[PDB]
Amino acid sequence: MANYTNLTQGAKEHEEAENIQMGTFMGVYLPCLQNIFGVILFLRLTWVVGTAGVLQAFAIVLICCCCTMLTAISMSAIATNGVVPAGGSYFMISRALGPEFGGAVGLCFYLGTTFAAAMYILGAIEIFLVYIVPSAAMLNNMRVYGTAFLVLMVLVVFIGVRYVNKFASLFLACVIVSILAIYAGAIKSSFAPPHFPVCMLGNRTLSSRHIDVCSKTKEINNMTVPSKLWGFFCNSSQFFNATCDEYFVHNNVTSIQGIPGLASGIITENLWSNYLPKGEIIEKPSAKSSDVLGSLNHEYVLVDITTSFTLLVGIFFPSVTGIMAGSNRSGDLKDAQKSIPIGTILAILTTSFVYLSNVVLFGACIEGVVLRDKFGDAVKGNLVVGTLSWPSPWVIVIGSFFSTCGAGLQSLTGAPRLLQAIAKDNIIPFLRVFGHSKANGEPTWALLLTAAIAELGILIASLDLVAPILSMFFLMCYLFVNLACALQTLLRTPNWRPRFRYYHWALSFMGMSICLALMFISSWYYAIVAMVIAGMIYKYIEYQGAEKEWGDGIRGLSLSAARFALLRLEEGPPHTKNWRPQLLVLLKLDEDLHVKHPRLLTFASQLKAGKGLTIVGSVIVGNFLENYGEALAAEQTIKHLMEAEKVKGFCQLVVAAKLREGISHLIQSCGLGGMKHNTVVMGWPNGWRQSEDARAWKTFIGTVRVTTAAHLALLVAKNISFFPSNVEQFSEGNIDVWWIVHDGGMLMLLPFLLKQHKVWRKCSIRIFTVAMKKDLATFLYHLRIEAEVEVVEMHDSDISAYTYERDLMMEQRSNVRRMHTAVKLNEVIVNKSHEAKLVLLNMPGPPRNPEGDENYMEFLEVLTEGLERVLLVRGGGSE
Amino acid sequence: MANYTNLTQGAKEHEEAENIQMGTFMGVYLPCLQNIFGVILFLRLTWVVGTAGVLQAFAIVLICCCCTMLTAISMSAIATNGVVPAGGSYFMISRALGPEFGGAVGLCFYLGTTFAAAMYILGAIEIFLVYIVPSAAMLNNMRVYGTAFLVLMVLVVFIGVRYVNKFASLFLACVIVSILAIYAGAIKSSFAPPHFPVCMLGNRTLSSRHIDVCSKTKEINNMTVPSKLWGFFCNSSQFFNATCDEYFVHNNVTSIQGIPGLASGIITENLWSNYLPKGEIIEKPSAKSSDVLGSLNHEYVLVDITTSFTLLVGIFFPSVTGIMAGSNRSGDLKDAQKSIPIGTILAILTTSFVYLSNVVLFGACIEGVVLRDKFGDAVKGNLVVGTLSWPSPWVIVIGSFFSTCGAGLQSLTGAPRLLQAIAKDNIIPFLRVFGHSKANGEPTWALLLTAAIAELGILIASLDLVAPILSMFFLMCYLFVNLACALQTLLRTPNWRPRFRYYHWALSFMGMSICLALMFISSWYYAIVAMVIAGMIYKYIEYQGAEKEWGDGIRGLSLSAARFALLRLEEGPPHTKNWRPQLLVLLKLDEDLHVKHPRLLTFASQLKAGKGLTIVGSVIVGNFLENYGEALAAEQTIKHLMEAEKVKGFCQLVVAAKLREGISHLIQSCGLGGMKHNTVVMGWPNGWRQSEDARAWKTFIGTVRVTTAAHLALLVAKNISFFPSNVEQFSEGNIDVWWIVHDGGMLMLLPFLLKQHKVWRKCSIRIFTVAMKKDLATFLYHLRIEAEVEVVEMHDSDISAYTYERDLMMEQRSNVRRMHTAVKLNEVIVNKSHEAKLVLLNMPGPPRNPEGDENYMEFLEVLTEGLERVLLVRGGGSE
Ligand SMILES: *[C@@H]1O[C@H](CO)[C@@H](O[C@@H]2O[C@H](CO)[C@@H](O[C@@H]3O[C@H](CO)[C@@H](O)[C@H](O)[C@@H]3O)[C@H](O)[C@H]2NC(C)=O)[C@H](O)[C@H]1NC(C)=O
Ligand SMILES: *[C@@H]1O[C@H](CO)[C@@H](O[C@@H]2O[C@H](CO)[C@@H](O[C@@H]3O[C@H](CO)[C@@H](O)[C@H](O)[C@@H]3O)[C@H](O)[C@H]2NC(C)=O)[C@H](O)[C@H]1NC(C)=O
Ligand SMILES: *[C@@H]1O[C@H](CO)[C@@H](O)[C@H](O)[C@H]1NC(C)=O
Ligand SMILES: *[C@@H]1O[C@H](CO)[C@@H](O)[C@H](O)[C@H]1NC(C)=O
């Protein structure tokens, strides 16, 4: 009806979409299914069931399926977020997780795929050599035949990939026919199981590759001659005073049925682990046996490797790898964000059900001795799982070989395409050589490097030793795919909208943890190497990206970090659960371009205590075209002064035509979006009455208006010349906070930030509240904070100029009286706090009409008449 | 003469220096020396040497000492950097590595010190019980007496820590006397060795706690009665028809000299590992032997644990820990940055020499069988190392017990002080309860928690199992102390000035690697757990510091990341090796407060490709006091427009009275210090002639002058209404770049960036150079990027307005002619590039006199007359 393929889509298929069909079954399901059903299912799954016991085999398959399923969930989250590129799964992963994670996952998955191309060649060779056409001799035969087969497959994928695309369907057909034959055999093995008997010597199993009858003597022409097995346990071969070894004279050779019925109940026997070390004779704990020993013979089927749990998990994991292949044919899709998750998860569920069912079927149909037999021995040299089939084990032994060579072709096509895709991106520079492609867009150098790595793999001519490396590389790939999603969900990474119905970051984190444990349990010494290689690739990609975009390596690296943090900072809830003063210190520069108030910087350092954001802003009156030299000079001066006063922050100078306009620009333009200030710290205009320039107090009140309108807090320090330094300290003193009717939050939060510094550390705090929603919060804060409270109530007229403005707020959401009341405020404040070390004090807002600015400044001046060091505070915002 | 201490200094002594002697030997040498020399040296060093063979024992001691030595170099780099706080080593590490690393190292070293207070109690109990006053019985005796001893020691520390301070000198005396006795025994043993004999039956070793004579018979009154050992090997006790066991009737008891002379040369025997598993009889491969076996008696000294190299390194590592104690008396110093490094390194060299010497001496003095005896048996139940001593083994048996009790006191005093120091810093919230102090400044609840954890340790009553956990915690502490220095040196962390003569970050990195390998080799089980615990505490401290300073958890976390990156960015070389345009798009806001040119944003997106820094600035004409609502509305509008055009960057609005002054403030003040821009992107003032308000071209040229003065690049896009959108593309075209005389960097770099975007991907590049060293640079760039070059020379007067400017540069380090030559430039440019999709084109500088501004604009308008899309470019800077 229709032709399809299961291979990948590299840069060749991506450049088509950059220059400018199938559903879920044929688009995402069949590709993932044909790539998960590897060779292990046919060559090591029975052996794993045997040497692990159905219970532990089920646990191993479940853990592997658990990591791969959680990784499928994370990969579906990656697939749904944003547009799905036309390329393979690598392009999706890159565009979703950034170039760093994209390249790390790409290289780990590529090493995985190369060693998979090696394992599948080794498996096809093992099937061809051992089962179809017959110690270290076997390893060298596998080496030479696997090298020949790899040189053949490389030429095939190099010359004629189109035929591989055409025959992918035949390979899938072979896989499915083989699995259905396995199931049909398991079923037919209920009533009529097959006739595969095994010669077993007591409870020690014998081979059958050369024996014919499981009897100590055969009878040709009524002559009780000794069977051929006599020649393998007795160096007499005649029975004429035969000198047989220990174990043979005592015990019995028996024809044990090798495949009992599915309902026979043999499962009760092999429900437990064996884990016998190397060279141990395989023992069935069912038949009778003597106790004599010593007869170490050649026909005893021996455990071929020192099996263990952590070894079995690694040997089995490369049968669940391949889930990223689900979305390696994503360019030819109709609804990608719908077709990819469903297809991938359904494929993984299908394969997990097949594996978990076959574990139990092998448990309950194959004898507990034929399962631990890792080379199909003891059954006259036929495939273990092959014995469970409807027609004959031949269907399985041919289907497995064709499937495994097809998967080898698949992995020698997907690995170099992925390598040219990682090369053309210029993510990693030195791989640029592999960016070269053929005329039709097929990799050439990538294919050669993949051939080299696959040959390196093949030189270890044993599935049991290649499987851990393959599994570790795919495990690292899945670990990064599971960790990047968790990170981008937690840290609110931009453009991370995982439009999935079931993806919760806990799932990806759980997958990361599960098969991180899998990596380490398999082999921690391989796993640390893999983690360090992946981390080095990740950091090198990050460094190259920084050098590419910003122009410098480490400079640009910190630049990228800052820019990314600021971006991530924008797309969030602009409010904060707590308010913290992030200061803009307004330093006034005299006509000599020196800081007219260093105590401003000293007090800012004492307020912020070396932490937080401090923007020191200053305006230089003049024309910028002919002042930039003076600008750089004064900026260096202010930076040196900031360093001298232990202020950590940034300096901004604006060369402006008018001081008021310069400061009005500074108050609203300082800081990059996200790193905005929230308070403006000003010095009081000392001698405003004595400076006949009418613009001093005007400029001050203008700055106050601009701050209030911008909804920033304001901290006007007065008599700042008498503020302390950083080296000196106070023996004993009282920070008196005079919280007038409104704006309590700042007035109480500041003296604690101050007393938390070494200078003001040894002083006490006294809250002289004068004028009840806010009242409750003060008690809670003072409980948080264990300072001292005090209430001093007075007449309403004295605080009229305050309450008036306060009233103006509630409806929103004279001068002679102001002066006659400010003196009352003076009376109380001095009579209580005259000898304080720092008096915080709430402020009234500036008048609406700019005419009473002289009156407002006189109000302030008299309000502060007689106090040593005053911190006028104004809220302005929400807090 | 002078009284001193070896304990630590917690918040008690730090608050004193915050409120406001000994040199190197008595200040930082002896405290470290008394604290490195622990119990292992006397109770397990001999067994380790025996079990490992002198070679592998030397390897163990060397690897451990190298880990701790590189950690000492990193710790000295920490000590020299900045003023050294008066508190313990914890305060130094905190003030040098930030509260995150400070708390992580503090807690890991604290758990280390607690399990050390447990191990030393176990050791004192083992010495008291096994040697001084005599299976699971031993373990339960150790549990009971260790719990009793911990209950006593907790009271001792709680009541009378001053006496621990007073008798630290006696403890050090005991340590050094024990070591000197070891050396005196070793030297004396050459000519005169002591008479410690060992019974040995063939090559199987016998015990000696109950047996008296190494003979199968003794003769009282000349009667051949069989020795007591006959009863322990024969159930007859009379020799009358003795039914003696197998290995006893055959072989020969021999009284082998247990301590042969240092000149005897036994080292040839015990130069090789034994690693015999649990329960194996200890064999000397020198004496004669029969071959029968089976008679597993109770008097055969056995291997008490399945020992391995990875186990021996863990068992021995808690003998090199203690270098952080070197600076536990850092408040009482004269020259801290000079005393601490030299003191610590000299103490570590002393202890390393002591260990590497005792290894070889035990190799050459103790029999190769008495070494593998882990409980001092076979020598009449005497301490194996004690046998090497001049006066008697009892000097060691007493000195070691007193030293181990003293080290228990030291580690039960250093752990609660450290815990209260971590608590009072408010680094971790929940530990606040442990900040509770006694009257004189001593911990109360921290002591209880330390006692609880030490008891949890003592429940494991075996040094061989407490040592790996102690070693893992101290190894994690050293790994963090090594990694933090390497990081802060690489990344150029602010205030990281390691004024040390020999510290290089490669040393700290090799130390981190060595000690990480040690962790994982010892037990990856505990290594992963410790790494995860320390990482969680680190991230949690970072989160708490964020929520403390910025006010929010994740918001504040990203804020802190950005602030730290920006700060790190300041203390560096402000120039970068490569020039990359970081755009400031000057968007023009109409009277409707709507962007008059979205194409500016589209083109900035195409130019930067969504990566890099893009600050979109705009001025609102008016007063800020009464426009803030309109300001926020237009800012939201511009943000929506930027997000619509895929522009990743920030937005800044300034409400100013004069558009020209607003722009002159934007250009020089945008961005936080470090994240400055270096290119200003403008839209051409279309219809400047048709506007009777001459302020259009005046403002444009003012902006150009400001950009030139600020030394920023300038990109004026003309006919921007024709610039393509994001969704469309160019099928084919040519970016014709006209590098006239100057600024080849930008003119060759911009079209490469543009062709790198999908819109301009399918177009080619043509350089129509018009006017030697600069031509060289062009060749290299074109070789790097593979674009097309071409040269079109013309007359000098035609480029007068350019070369004139050029002349002004050389000395640094008319209108009718310019116009009539501009039309010639027009003829060339149109004849070559009329149909070009985008003509880049160099700019002349604006006239020095502001009168020719109309003439300058007419010159530009002519120069650009007839072209579809022009990008006027001006370098301005260094590049
Ligand atoms: C297959 O047959 C062989 C030969 O009989 C089995 O080896 C023998 O198994 C018996 C089991 O009872 C072992 O006896 C054991 O001896 C130890 C030592 O005294 C005793 O503590 C136990 O209680 C038990 O009686 C016998 O030692 C062993 N022969 C050896 C090890 O040489 C083998 O176990 C059989 N396999 C299975 C799976 O049953
Ligand atoms: C202490 O004495 C015992 C008793 O003689 C030693 O056990 C025996 O050691 C000999 C060493 O020559 C072993 O001989 C070896 O036998 C194996 C297997 O037959 C053979 O392949 C070797 O080439 C060698 O001839 C003998 O098996 C062993 N007896 C056992 C294991 O039951 C023991 O080695 C002595 N210990 C030391 C440290 O010398
Ligand atoms: C071997 O078989 C014979 C007869 O079938 C039986 O008598 C004998 O007990 C068997 N041997 C064992 C060890 O079961
Ligand atoms: C035990 O000692 C006797 C007497 O010296 C000697 O003849 C015999 O060979 C020794 N046996 C062994 C096994 O060395």
From Swiss-Prot, chains A, B:
Q: How is its activity regulated?
A: Inhibited following phosphorylation by OXSR1/OSR1 and STK39/SPAK: phosphorylation takes place downstream of WNK kinases (WNK1, WNK2, WNK3 or WNK4) in response to hyperosmotic stress and subsequent cell shrinkage. Activated by N-ethylmaleimide (NEM). Inhibited by DIOA, bumetanide and furosemide.
Under InterPro entries, the record lists:
AA-permease/SLC12A_dom, KCL_cotranspt, SLC12_C, SLC12A_fam
What is the tissue localization of expression for this protein? Expressed in brain (at protein level). Highly expressed in heart, brain and kidney. Detected at lower levels in skeletal muscle, placenta, lung and pancreas. Detected in umbilical vein endothelial cells.
Question: Keyword set for this entry?
Answer: Cell membrane, Charcot-Marie-Tooth disease, Chloride, Disease variant, Disulfide bond, Glycoprotein, Ion transport, Membrane, Metal-binding, Neurodegeneration, Neuropathy, Phosphoprotein, Potassium, Potassium transport, Symport, Transmembrane, Transmembrane helix, Transport
Q: What is the effect of changing residue 410 to A?
A: Decrease in Cl(-) efflux
PANTHER family in the record, alphabetically? SOLUTE CARRIER FAMILY 12 MEMBER 6, SOLUTE CARRIER FAMILY 12, CATION COTRANSPORTERS
| Noted disease | Agenesis of the corpus callosum, with peripheral neuropathy: A disease that is characterized by severe progressive sensorimotor neuropathy, intellectual disability, dysmorphic features and complete or partial agenesis of the corpus callosum.
| Name of the featured protein | Solute carrier family 12 member 6
Q: Which organism is it from?
A: Homo sapiens (Human)
